[model samples]
Target: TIKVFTTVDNINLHTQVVDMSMTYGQQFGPTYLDGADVTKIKPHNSHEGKTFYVLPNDDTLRVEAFEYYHTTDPSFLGRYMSALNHTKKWKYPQVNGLTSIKWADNNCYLATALLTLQQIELKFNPPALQDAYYRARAGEAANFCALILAYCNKTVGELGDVRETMSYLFQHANLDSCKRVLNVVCKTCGQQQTTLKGVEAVMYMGTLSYEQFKKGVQIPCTCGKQATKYLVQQESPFVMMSAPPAQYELKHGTFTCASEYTGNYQCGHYKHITSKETLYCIDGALLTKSSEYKGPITDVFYKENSYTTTIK
Candidate 1:
């Protein structure tokens, strides 16, 4: 579960427009930043609030996927996808119309917190979570942290343990809590709107698991540029399979590009594919027998966890 802060111009609009806690079927704490607080904030939107929800952290498309598995009802899957779609709609909009604009203010933050919670608590299997971690278009460390926390949560308890461990990890990483400070700066400076560098993001995610974490995973520049250059040039973008206001799936597998490359193409698809292929671990001994590659190159191999090609 995660606590989120939503801000808008007026207080009253929170219930009618901003807060979607009930809509998500979430059991939340008391609402913070009520109408009066929202009025004080004087945000561009109509309302804002801060509340927390408990989400089972699972890496799959839905948290229930992990818990219910074979027992999952088809209708529940529909609802789960429905909820995820709605959550994403507010987080990333494809259009610049009134609906999109309305979601921009408060619900985006709310959706992100919820999504983070889901990512951390519901995705328990390390390998499965790692797959999602590698495949994410952006926020590699954040997403990986969520997955690691989920593993801890499944074994230790709920999100509280995950949050505690995160606090410890961040504190240990930076004596001065650099990542935490950066998060604050990110929210203020709008850096969260940008994607962390793909290589760096993958490296960061690799640090979350025992198998891959601190395994000397070296991140390389995608465009053959300096690491610093790639980091600055890469930006993050969000895409939704469904539209906001209603979490109904009007379409499937909808993709959106937030940042474009040198050719004016959105970077999401490119980054996603690159991330999936490049981030993994392999036995060094296998490279000796390899000749010229014919198909997709297998950089790493593990007997217990080898990937196989599937013909669909």
Candidate 2:
């Protein structure tokens, strides 16, 4: 009822300048939501989000398929789509003015739905609260999030634990629900699944896990010949889903490139070294005190660092 002007529903039926949204939200809300609980709704745009209710069903996102209501105000669908774009960290679709927009394709909004719960909580609750009340409210919020996510498992199978929790909350829509959001099933991939030459990787018999494989996974180039470290390159959501991040890191160690026993130590040239009364160049040349190369040099370099980098 528009009379429930004080309700969570953003939809209405009015005839003012901004009143268009109320009618629009009411008209289109059902098109996006198969049969969602309208009682549990949030205004995607009230002033910033005044009308246009966004409802949470299973793992699907529903909104108007357009950009604006008229020439000025943003449509409810546009607001929901924007929320998805921002939540999933998408490139945020750009509109070609008031005519049309290119909504990004193949995005999942399960994450965003969970985020919306968090957002609504912010409005229903408070930015700040008493310590005890806050804790209790926080627990309730957690339960709701879990339940809402569980509620939306409408597919033949289900959203799993999230769906179970969701069904539980659907019965209790007294309010709250999710763990996998609207795009929870969108699909993600394994970390460090890449094996590029300059990238790094780890091997559990040489395989990768597609979920939570971040820790114990980032290893630098341990080339055996030298010691080194590497930074994992910043991976985009696209790369992560397509395959894995860079692996094997780098071919050469950061510490020493040529490694031990792999460089020239010509006679008559004072090469840096540590010695047990003697040492030879990586090129197998004997150190000599004279240009004639006949003097048995006994001088050795002092200790500094690394196996072969001991200072002279």
Best by lDDT: 1
Misplaced by over 4 Å in model 2 are 6-36, 39-139, 142-222, 225-312
Task: Report lDDT (CA) for all predictions.
Answer: 0.24, 0.23
> What's the CA error at residue 276 for candidate 1, in Å?
17
Off by over 4 Å in 1: 1-27, 30-139, 153-312
- Of candidate 2, the 10-residue stretch with the lowest lDDT total is 178-187
TM-score on alpha carbons, each prediction: 0.18, 0.18
The lowest-lDDT stretch of 10 consecutive residues in candidate 1 is 267-276
**Number of colliding residue pairs in each model:** 17, 33
Q: What is the C-alpha lDDT profile of model 1 across 107-225, one tens digit per residue?
A: 22222222332222123223434354443323222233333333322221122221233333322221221111001112123222234322222123212122332122233344433
